[PDB]
Symmetry: D2
Subunit: 319 residues, 4 copies
Amino acid sequence: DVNTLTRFVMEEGRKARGTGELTQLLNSLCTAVKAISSAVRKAGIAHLYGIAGVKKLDVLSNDLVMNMLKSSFATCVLVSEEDKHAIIVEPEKRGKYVVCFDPLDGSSNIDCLVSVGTIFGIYRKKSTDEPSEKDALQPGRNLVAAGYALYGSATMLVLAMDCGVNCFMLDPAIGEFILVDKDVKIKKKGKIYSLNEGYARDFDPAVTEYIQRKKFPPDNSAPYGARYVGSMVADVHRTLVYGGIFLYPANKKSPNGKLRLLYECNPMAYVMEKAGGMATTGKEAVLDVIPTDIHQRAPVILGSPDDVLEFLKVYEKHS
Amino acid sequence: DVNTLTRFVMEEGRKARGTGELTQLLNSLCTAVKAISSAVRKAGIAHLYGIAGSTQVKKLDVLSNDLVMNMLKSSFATCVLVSEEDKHAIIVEPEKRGKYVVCFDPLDGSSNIDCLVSVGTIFGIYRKKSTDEPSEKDALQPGRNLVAAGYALYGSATMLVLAMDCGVNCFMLDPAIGEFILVDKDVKIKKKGKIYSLNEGYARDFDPAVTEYIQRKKFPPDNSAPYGARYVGSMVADVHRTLVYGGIFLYPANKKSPNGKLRLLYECNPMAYVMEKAGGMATTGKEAVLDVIPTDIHQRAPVILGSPDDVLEFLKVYEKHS
Amino acid sequence: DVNTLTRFVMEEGRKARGTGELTQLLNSLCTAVKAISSAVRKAGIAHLYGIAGVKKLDVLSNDLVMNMLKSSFATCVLVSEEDKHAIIVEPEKRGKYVVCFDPLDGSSNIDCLVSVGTIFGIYRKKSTDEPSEKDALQPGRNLVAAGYALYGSATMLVLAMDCGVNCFMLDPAIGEFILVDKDVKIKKKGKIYSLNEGYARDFDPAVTEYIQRKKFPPDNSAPYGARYVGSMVADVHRTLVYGGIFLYPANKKSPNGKLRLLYECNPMAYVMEKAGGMATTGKEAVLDVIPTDIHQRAPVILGSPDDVLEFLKVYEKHS
Amino acid sequence: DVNTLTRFVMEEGRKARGTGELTQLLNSLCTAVKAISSAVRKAGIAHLYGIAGKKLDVLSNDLVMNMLKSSFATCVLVSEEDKHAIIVEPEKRGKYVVCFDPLDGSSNIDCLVSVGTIFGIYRKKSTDEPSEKDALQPGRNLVAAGYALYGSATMLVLAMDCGVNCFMLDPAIGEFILVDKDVKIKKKGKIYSLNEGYARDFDPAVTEYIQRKKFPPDNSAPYGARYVGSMVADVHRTLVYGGIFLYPANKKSPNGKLRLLYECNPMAYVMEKAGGMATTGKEAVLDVIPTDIHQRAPVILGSPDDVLEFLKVYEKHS
Ligand SMILES: CC(C)=CCC/C(C)=C\CC/C(C)=C/CC/C(C)=C/COP(=O)(O)OP(=O)(O)O
Ligand SMILES: Nc1ncnc2c1ncn2[C@@H]1O[C@H](COP(=O)(O)O)[C@@H](O)[C@H]1O
Ligand SMILES: Nc1ncnc2c1ncn2[C@@H]1O[C@H](COP(=O)(O)O)[C@@H](O)[C@H]1O
Ligand SMILES: Nc1ncnc2c1ncn2[C@@H]1O[C@H](COP(=O)(O)O)[C@@H](O)[C@H]1O
Ligand SMILES: Nc1ncnc2c1ncn2[C@@H]1O[C@H](COP(=O)(O)O)[C@@H](O)[C@H]1O
Ligand SMILES: O=P(O)(O)OC[C@H]1O[C@](O)(COP(=O)(O)O)[C@@H](O)[C@@H]1O
Ligand SMILES: O=P(O)(O)OC[C@H]1O[C@](O)(COP(=O)(O)O)[C@@H](O)[C@@H]1O
Ligand SMILES: O=P(O)(O)OC[C@H]1O[C@](O)(COP(=O)(O)O)[C@@H](O)[C@@H]1O
Ligand SMILES: O=P(O)(O)OC[C@H]1O[C@](O)(COP(=O)(O)O)[C@@H](O)[C@@H]1O
Ligand SMILES: [Mg+2]
Ligand SMILES: [Mg+2]
Ligand SMILES: [Mg+2]
Ligand SMILES: [Mg+2]
Ligand SMILES: [Mg+2]
Ligand SMILES: [Mg+2]
Ligand SMILES: [Mg+2]
Ligand SMILES: [Mg+2]
């Protein structure tokens, strides 16, 4: 029996006895993602090059997500990688939910046509006060839903909630997200490690030792393969589907890591944990970090539970 | 003025005073690339999952091979076809026989298909040189003999990169109209880049020259900035980023693979031809990739390619290790 | 604020305090219409002609609507123009609603590439009896929702409910129906008449007289223009947009006309009346006919109220 | 073997030993038609209605105009949208003159009726500097003509010396696929097509002929009536199903309504190449010598037997 993102989301809303507000948020997000996919894939580019005789993808993607979420009547605070401060929804359009998102992840990769994506995390506003940027400062444990859209060789939306992780393929012929992977679980242990080894000179000693174990296995297993696409959504999605480990640890140009807690690390950590994986900063679970800045960065090590636990053991040995 | 791949190829054929046979070959290739691209982006996947009930099923690698084979045969422009999917070269039937020999990888990056990472198609076009009946040996030409080569990349967007004597030109596929649009003319690679690309998981089996060269990128002895690392895992994606951003891409020989992994005829040679036409380099370490005279249509070759300064720097380290 | 069919349908369900079953039905119907539209526009026809080295459009369209409605868990009885008997949904997937539909209207225009469409009408099951065809034998007055999809120069879905008639344009780039005309109302009087004048030799006398007045007005008024696409959806949609009158009347050889009450006349009559128009069989309003057979025919005269009332005046003259 | 419009046009050019100029013209026109089809079908309409926070007539004209100019194959372009002929700048001039309606039937586009692009291609006849008069050639001189129908599906019908060929646009890949080769119209049809709202204005020959279709004096079956209201849609049905299409003169349109250069002549050329007929009542449409680029003509076209039967009735009334 075929299922779609629209029907699946609506059915889960009916099960939870929701008022329909979260369902409208997800429907609006789904529409914005389809519009981003069309633009990322350069539909209409012929008009830019004069077939009949202007917006950067970063701005258009932000505008698409911002406008659809505002018009959903489901949100009150919107945090985006593109905006210095949180956007406060006007009272007439205001709902209960706080959405933190990266409208287009993979900035180094647009010009070379490597996979990009959108990352999102949805929180519930806990106060009766007027909404503010402070409402976005919540640990990932408070996430109601999270996931990402990957604009790779095909477009797929991965949605994680209490019920688990579910993957939907965009059928561009009919503009419909089709459920293709139900209740997905990551492999217990993988065979691929993913990180930028160009920072080897500045690596944490724990990072250096862990990578050495991947290349020279102490138990005489086969060495891991290496893959680093350079876009977090692509590297994380491969980790979900194939298993393994993804790392963006602290380096010296990024003593707290590079990736952003609220809208990059927390959503990916939430997807991993709902899929039976792990996601750590080295000191604690990513989802347990209590942020003080909506744009604060965090080191992230996520993936198959046996691979993350192995890195943690190396990290503990180095204190 | 706006320019399309169809218009561009036709005009180049007019300039060269061709009979139109190569123009028809390229037209058929472009149509096949559009069809592969549509399937890669999963058009009609809803029917596979039962939107209409239990009433295509072919895997993308099979369908891509079928598309390129059928379109090239129907172009009336080819006589010998070499594919990664077939052990022996396909000899085109006499009724549909043209002058050209095409070696192609219909869908490069197989390990990345299920994780939705960029994949692509690679092709190299040769002119038949002998007067014998067409056979496999007509595909055993060095890359120097290439008439045209390039690739289609099915990434965040779909781009056809076409390299010929006139240089390298990039076309963006506009899916709204099914038209490849010329977006970068006569592209030239950077003299030197800041990205290195290889599978470092094989470090234990690295050739000593590779070990030293990679060490130079992570720990530059001259106090310059260490290079960034990128390894998508699909040759088309990694090569295209090298073309666009500069840098170096390596799939070298190792202790277990004396001839590397990538195939000379339809992976290394077309990429080498694109790199050289763009002002880059492509070597096996011992010689230029384009100068290797193959004896087997599926023989492997080590490949190091990218910005000329970076490739030369590797060759310096390679010669130090002899 | 931009509005989509998905968001509009969901919000109307929230206002109605529905359980979400009708919303799921409409979502499923929306997906099927997009799938039909993609097939009608011949997506993938290159593979049928051997680009890589069978099912009629009516059958595929019927399969799409049948499967999407069944999997919605919202229907119990399905009456299609393409099926001899009413289809009874398997007990595990049964919902409260009865759907009568023509999956592809205008079959004679398929091969000449003239506009075609899909017509649907939605009823609530009125009894707790075991579902059967009698649950579809309801007067059009009992309709909960009705409308049509038009696959013309563009694809549009027209949805009629208690709130009125709303028109949504399908954006193929993203597979989204965009609300473009809200709460639409037909003109009081039009200037176009629509019927197959090739049947003039067998015309009912009222039809002969009425059409004669349209072409040779006794006033000093201009004669009406003539349009007859040959697909009911296209001719009716033009009547809604421009005003005027559409007729497929009875004659001596066809005392009940040709068009079918359940899935052609009732849905179009419902749209017309919600738009401020009329639709009559001559003897009574189309929506007041109580059917006894699921494929029973009915004469239909519909359009602007002044034009329909003028025809009924001529109809009364000939008894 | 699968065949595309691009391959078909190129192979025909190779057969004709052309220099490739007309092939570039047809390739450019094919690209514009795909762009019009995407726009007609409302791709990206969500952005017009504010998803992120040019009228079809003008945009269709710009697509055809720009693609034809950049083809380097044209010198004079006549469009229904432009009052005067467009003269290509000398640097981009080719030998061909193109007369087209970029979007026919758009006068009723608000009801989503089928629309289309109609085109006729001429070789420049005179050696004078290019001007409007270069488009005043009879339809007899057409090198190529046809139309793109944006109906339930998009199809390009291309008529040349070799005959009439029909290509379906596969929107999944943006490729025109040859689906009907060397098509011929039925000798006699069963459908008549015209706006009977002008019945009060019809000349006695038209009135008698239509009466014969509804009341056949020989007890045969009456013809069916179809009138989409868009010339491309009605003519294509006539080509594919057989029958007759009529837009005769009336009080509002004493010289007819449809345009000779870019509506009647291309459709007349397609019909004759398909074994059909197209007449004004007095002469073949293709033999009329235009004096004004936007001049109108009455037209009766379709299956040869149906047009011949009309012409007997016309002769009966002188
Ligand atoms: C919208 C549907 C289902 C069909 C008909 C109704 C309309 C309104 C317009 C269709 C005209 C058309 C231009 C169809 C092409 C649709 C299409 C193939 C959309 C997706 O574009 P892709 O070429 O698939 O983009 P990607 O392959 O890069 O995802
Ligand atoms: N579509 C849905 N899928 C999963 N959970 C939902 C959905 N809708 C609502 N919920 C749950 O119900 C809560 C309240 O719903 P709402 O009234 O829509 O805010 C949410 O915070 C979720 O915990
Ligand atoms: N479209 C084209 N672009 C570039 N070079 C071409 C083209 N067509 C033909 N040529 C050149 O002309 C030669 C003969 O053309 P052909 O007659 O098509 O075999 C080719 O091998 C190329 O060197
Ligand atoms: N999306 C909707 N739009 C309009 N009316 C609705 C909607 N959902 C429910 N209703 C109304 O509420 C009734 C019961 O809804 P349900 O519980 O979904 O069967 C329907 O029969 C309609 O009258
Ligand atoms: N693709 C083609 N299809 C049919 N006829 C063509 C084609 N190309 C050229 N011709 C014929 O050759 C003539 C001269 O071609 P050209 O040199 O392209 O102007 C044209 O006017 C046509 O009669
Ligand atoms: O070049 P680096 O340092 O390895 O950065 C890679 C990471 O940076 C990012 O590009 C940051 O996201 P943005 O591109 O949206 O700024 C991640 O997607 C990616 O994982
Ligand atoms: O996993 P590895 O050893 O790094 O191999 C990666 C290379 O193998 C390939 O996948 C070989 O191409 P195919 O997938 O067509 O066999 C290249 O695309 C890629 O550069
Ligand atoms: O050719 P006729 O007798 O005028 O019939 C036209 C009518 O028949 C129909 O085609 C019946 O619908 P179907 O094509 O689905 O059978 C209507 O769409 C149309 O209004
Ligand atoms: O409304 P009428 O008088 O029947 O005219 C119909 C004719 O007018 C036209 O719409 C004129 O063409 P345009 O719509 O492009 O101006 C023809 O397509 C059609 O055959
Ligand atoms: Mg970003
Ligand atoms: Mg990011
Ligand atoms: Mg390969
Ligand atoms: Mg391969
Ligand atoms: Mg039907
Ligand atoms: Mg019908
Ligand atoms: Mg017009
Ligand atoms: Mg016109």
